[PDB]
């Protein structure tokens, strides 16, 4: 299941998307090109509307190559998959189709 | 139903995996030795008129006789063999008999066998009183050639030159030392084609001990200082001699 672009969910609710490079026996996962996205719920109150809208703002920070312990790892989901003809003895010669044949 | 039978038969007789070429093909086999024996006996010296069709070919096989001489003398029996059998490729007129073999040996085994020959011949020459050398040529000129069947076919041969191997000291090679192709039916060679060998440490030690009169006692390569090939080539290029 290595080298597949996946997103893993941490125990603190933070998501990490990237290419899974290696995994161990205790599920300690080392992944490269990691982007940590946190979906924090914020109650933004408009100046004209009295109802405050609860929006899940996603803050994304690029970390790079990160190794995470398996005790704080919760779950992961795959996002995207991964991203000798020898020459024979044949020859080609122009030719002609020969004499016309009766029906 | 006749259509199904004839279609299946046609399809098999055209696309079966035994007829890739149109005919059932086999591997060329070995005739009895008595076939060649009868042919050579029948043609004799080519003096009957029956074999007038066989004369042009026979005289034309003169061209390949040198090559037969090479193969015959190459596959000669060694002194420890009373007799040897060889595969021959023979012409069906009896014109040519080419020995179809390569005298392929294990180098430690061959080297030790010939070293034991050196020992045995020296001991016998020290033990014999008067050594009668054989006459050359062995047979008088006007004698007809010896037929195999009447003269040699059933005759028990004499004892070959072999050394009295000690049963206890030479127990590694005792049972196979003087066989024709030693260890051919063992897990010590790849098979009957006899092309790779492996020998255990006791066997290699025993073969090293038996080859003492021949094997080299030089261990240090520094023994060959200024007496190696590059030194001889340098001395040749310089018109000097070591």
């Amino acid at each position: 299941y290595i080298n597949w672009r996946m997103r893993v969910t941490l125990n603190d609710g933070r998501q990490m998307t990237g290419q899974m490079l290696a995994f161990d026996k205790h599920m300690n996962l080392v992944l490269a090109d990691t982007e940590e996205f946190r979906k924090t719920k914020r109650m933004q109150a408009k100046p004209n509307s009295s109802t405050t809208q609860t929006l899940i703002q996603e803050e994304k920070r690029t970390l790079g190559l990160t190794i995470v312990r398996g005790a704080n790892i919760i779950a992961l989901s795959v996002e995207s998959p991964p991203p000798t003809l020898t020459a024979g003895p044949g020859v080609a010669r122009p030719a002609g189709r020969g004499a016309a044949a009766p029906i | 139903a006749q259509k199904k039978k004839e279609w299946l038969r046609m399809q098999r007789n055209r696309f079966g995996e035994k007829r890739k070429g149109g005919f059932v093909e086999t591997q060329k086999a070995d005739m009895p030795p008595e076939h060649l024996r009868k042919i050579v006996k029948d043609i004799g010296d080519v003096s009957q008129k029956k074999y007038t069709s066989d004369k042009r070919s026979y005289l034309g096989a003169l061209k390949f006789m040198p090559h037969a001489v090479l193969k015959l003398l190459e596959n000669m029996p060694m002194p420890w063999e009373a007799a040897r059998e060889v595969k021959v490729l023979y012409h069906v007129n009896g014109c040519l008999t080419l020995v179809n073999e390569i005298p392929r040996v294990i180098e430690p085994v061959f080297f030790a066998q010939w070293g034991s020959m050196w020992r045995t011949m020296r001991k016998e020459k020290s033990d014999r009183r008067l050594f009668k050398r054989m006459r050359f040529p062995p047979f008088d000129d006007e004698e007809p050639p010896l037929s195999w069947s009447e003269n040699i076919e059933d005759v028990e041969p004499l004892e070959p030159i072999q050394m009295e191997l000690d049963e206890d000291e030479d127990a590694a090679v005792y049972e196979w030392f003087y066989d024709h192709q030693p260890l051919i039916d063992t897990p010590h060679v790849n098979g009957p084609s006899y092309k790779r060998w492996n020998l255990t440490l006791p066997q290699m030690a025993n073969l090293y001990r038996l080859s003492e009169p021949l094997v080299s006692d030089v261990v240090d390569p520094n023994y060959f200082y200024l007496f190696e090939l590059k030194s001889f080539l340098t001395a040749k290029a310089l018109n000097v001699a070591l």
Partner: protein
């Protein structure tokens, strides 16, 4: 009007097989050529340019009698008289895998061009095997009582066009594993069933030297037989002649046993061409799928003639 195409010569003779060619197919973009022949070999050529034999595929233990291309043209599909199917990779020239489960000689096969990927093999034990091109085991197989020499997949992907030595085209359904209906009318052993590119006509040449075009459409009379073209007599050998359609569905090209490939007009039944050029029987006569006037005729002269239709 000397020459109107992209080939560097109006005729090219592709040679290099040491045995009789039985099939030859085009890449569905009209760019690559695959020919399987009785010397157990699939030779892979370019059609545009200097036309080098860029590849040879070995690995069948007996005569090769069919091959289709994939959707893109990256995986080849070879049926062979070693009772086997095989899927081949053209990125490396190696073999992906072999499909096993037939007991006698395999004559036909078909890949579903669009729909879901299935290989459809007619084999002389009396079987029509439906295979998935990822597992070597047969997904299913339909039992008949006669050898099958012809097979085509429907446009809807569930009807099977079998043709046996029992002299009639049978349309089966995969789900019920039973024959839907038989277009009878032929007198001799069926060889090729190729659906029309639009999908309403079926070409069928049999050993009686007559090539008939039939209906495919669900609304049709009792006799679905459109036309019986004649003019391509079959020779001495009882080969499995493989005809084809043009891209526009207007021209019918079938090889013949005199070395001549015969093209009729599918609309009316007029002999458009009677192109000579071969010594033995012509086994596989095909059009260019791109729509160019390129025709290919692979014959058991160990040769292929790649020519033009001006």
């Amino acid at each position: 009007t000397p020459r109107t195409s992209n080939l560097k010569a109006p005729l090219m003779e592709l040679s290099g097989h040491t045995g009789e060619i039985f099939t030859a197919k085009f890449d569905p973009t009209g760019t690559l050529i695959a020919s399987g022949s009785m010397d157990r070999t699939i030779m892979l050529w370019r059609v545009y340019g200097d036309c080098e034999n860029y590849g040879v595929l070995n690995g069948h233990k007996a005569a090769i009698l069919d091959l289709q291309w994939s959707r893109d043209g990256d995986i080849l599909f070879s049926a062979s008289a070693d009772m086997h199917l095989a899927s081949w990779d053209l990125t490396t020239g190696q073999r992906i895998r072999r499909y096993i489960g037939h007991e006698e000689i395999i004559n036909a096969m078909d890949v579903t061009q669009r729909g879901e990927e299935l290989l459809i093999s007619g084999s002389d034990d009396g079987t029509i095997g439906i295979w998935d091109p990822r597992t070597k085991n047969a997904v299913d197989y339909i039992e008949t009582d006669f050898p099958i020499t012809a097979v085509a997949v429907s446009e809807a992907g569930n009807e099977i066009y079998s043709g046996g030595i029992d002299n009639d085209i049978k349309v089966w359904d995969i789900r019920k594993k039973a024959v839907v209906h038989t277009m009878l009318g032929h007198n001799d052993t069926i060889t090729t069933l190729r659906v029309s590119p639009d999908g309403q006509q079926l070409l069928s040449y049999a050993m009686d030297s007559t090539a008939r075009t039939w209906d495919i459409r669900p609304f049709a009379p009792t006799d679905r037989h459109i036309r019986t073209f004649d003019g391509a007599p079959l020779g001495l050998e009882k080969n499995l002649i493989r005809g084809s359609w043009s891209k526009d569905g207007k021209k019918i090209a079938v090889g013949a046993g005199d070395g001549t490939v015969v093209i009729w007009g599918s609309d009316t039944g007029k002999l458009l061409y009677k192109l000579p050029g071969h010594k033995g029987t012509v086994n596989c006569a095909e059009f260019a799928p791109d729509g160019a006037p390129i025709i290919l005729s692979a014959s058991s002269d160990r040769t292929m003639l790649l020519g033009e239709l001006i």
